[PDB]
């Protein structure tokens, strides 16, 4: 169906390990969108064809205001192209580096949006497993949208693919290569809440080896300015035992979230 000839390409929107993402306009409709380009040579080398198929299959059937749309895909002799909804206000990552830290109202509102999206995903037993600021995009009204479903799967699951970069958002069961389920996304939600309020993730360190250590032992502390409500929520999410982490309804109904969020469940 779609082919490269159908689009006018514009400015680079960002880069990933495999993804190179561009603004684009479809020629006869003038529809503005984002084109995610992947190189087949690099995909075959890393052996991650199965991850891309899951990305397309999982993300194209989800429909939620806080999840980025995937409309389709095409490919030629050297490249694969994913046709995505364009997110005009950029990444939460860029926003955090602009402001250093988020206030309590901004943080709680982002957490509500994230928990709504994740609740919808978990109702289909879909787990994202790669929730982090560079994969959270912003729509035209500043609303958060989850993107980048390359690591997503159906629970329960193991891991058959090498962990590439940062350990910072992963739970103990995941980094220890053990068995895992939906509760992994709840751990990540805790890491994000901390990073939004403080400016850095709670297990950050100078080496892989030591980050692994801080995560497996759940070794984190709070700066003085983090309030008692925020501390309570984060402490509940960052539990070593997955079955002790709260359900998402409990997150959405936590007194600190209800007091500070400007959006409903």
Ligand X SMILES: CCOc1ccc2nc(C)sc2c1
* Footprint of ligand ADP (CB under 6 A): 13-14, 16-19, 21, 34, 36, 68, 84-87, 91, 134-135, 137, 147-148, 150
* Residue 86 marked in a binding site: yes
In the DSSP assignment, the letter for residue 180 is B
* Residue 15 marked in a binding site: no
In the DSSP assignment, the letter for residue 165 is S
H or E element in which residue 195 lies = helix 183-198
SS3 173: helix
Is 43 a binder of ligand X (CB under 6 A)? yes
Q: Which does 110 bind (CB under 5 to 8 A by kind): Cl ion, ligand ADP, ligand X, none?
A: none
Q: Which is nearer to ligand X, 38 or 198 (CB)?
A: 38
- Residue, CB closest to ligand ADP: 16
Is 135 a binder of Mg ion (CB under 5 A)? yes
Q: Which is nearer to ligand ADP, 24 or 237 (CB)?
A: 24
CB 104 within 8 A of CB 230: yes
Q: Which is nearer to Mg ion, 137 or 189 (CB)?
A: 137
Tell which residue, 54, 42, 22, has the closest CA to residue 157: 54
Distance CA 82, CA 55 (A): 10
- Applying CB under 5 A, among 5, 140, 160, 209 the residue interacting with Cl ion is 160
Only segment of 110-118, 130-138, 162-170, 185-193 that touches Mg ion (CB under 5 A):
130-138
Tell which residue, 126, 92, 93, has the closest CA to residue 109: 92
Only segment of 134-142, 190-198, 205-213, 241-249 that touches Mg ion (CB under 5 A):
134-142
* Residue 6 marked in a binding site: no
Distance CA 110, CA 133 (A): 11
- Applying CB under 5 A, among 65, 235, 249, 258 the residue interacting with Cl ion is 249
Distance CA 79, CA 40 (A): 5
Encoded tokens for 96: 């955090």
Is 148 a binder of Mg ion (CB under 5 A)? yes
Q: Which does 16 bind (CB under 5 to 8 A by kind): ligand X, Mg ion, Cl ion, none?
A: Mg ion
* Nearest 10 degrees: Cα torsion 59, 146, 11, 73: 0
DSSP string, 228-252: HHHHHHHHHHS-SSGGGSPPHHHHH
Residues noted as catalytic:
130
Tell which residue, 1, 37, 33, has the closest CA to residue 17: 37
Is 46 a binder of Cl ion (CB under 5 A)? no
Residue 72's Cβ-side half-sphere holds a number of Cα atoms within 13 Å equal to 7
* Residue 200 marked in a binding site: no
Q: Which does 159 bind (CB under 5 to 8 A by kind): Mg ion, Cl ion, ligand X, none?
A: Cl ion
Interface residues toward Mg ion, by CB under 5 A: 16, 135, 148, 150
Binding residues: 17, 36, 85-87, 134-135, 148
Binding site for ligand X (CB under 6 A): 40, 43-44, 49, 52-53, 56, 73, 75, 80
Binding-site positions for ATP read 17, 36, 85-87, 134-135, 148
């Amino acid at each position: 169906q779609w082919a490269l000839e159908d689009f006018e390409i514009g400015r680079p929107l960002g880069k990933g390990k495999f993804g190179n993402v561009y603004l684009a306009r479809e020629k006869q409709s003038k529809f503005i969108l984002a084109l995610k380009v992947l190189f087949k040579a690099q995909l075959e080398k890393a052996g991650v064809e199965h991850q891309l198929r899951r990305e397309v299959e999982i993300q194209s059937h989800l429909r939620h205001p806080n999840i980025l749309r995937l409309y389709g895909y095409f490919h030629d002799a050297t490249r694969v192209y994913l046709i995505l909804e364009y997110a005009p206000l950029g990444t939460v990552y860029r926003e955090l580096q602009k402001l250093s830290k988020f206030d309590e109202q901004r943080t709680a509102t982002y957490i509500t949006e994230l928990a709504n999206a994740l609740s919808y995903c978990h109702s289909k037993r879909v787990i994202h497993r790669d929730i982090k600021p560079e994969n959270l995009l912003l729509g035209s009204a500043g609303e958060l949208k989850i993107a980048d479903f390359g690591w997503s799967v159906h629970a329960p699951s193991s891991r058959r693919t090498t962990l590439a970069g940062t350990l910072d958002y992963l739970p103990p069961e995941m980094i220890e290569g053990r068995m895992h389920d939906e509760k992994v996304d709840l751990w990540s939600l805790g890491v994000l809440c901390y990073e939004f309020l403080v400016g850095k993730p709670p297990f950050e360190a100078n080496t892989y080896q030591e980050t692994y250590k801080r995560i497996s032992r759940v070794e984190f502390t709070f700066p003085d300015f983090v309030t008692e409500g925020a501390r309570d929520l984060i402490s509940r999410l960052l539990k070593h035992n997955p079955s002790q982490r709260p359900m998402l309804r409990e997150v959405l109904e936590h007194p600190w979230i209800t007091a500070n969020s400007s959006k409903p469940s």
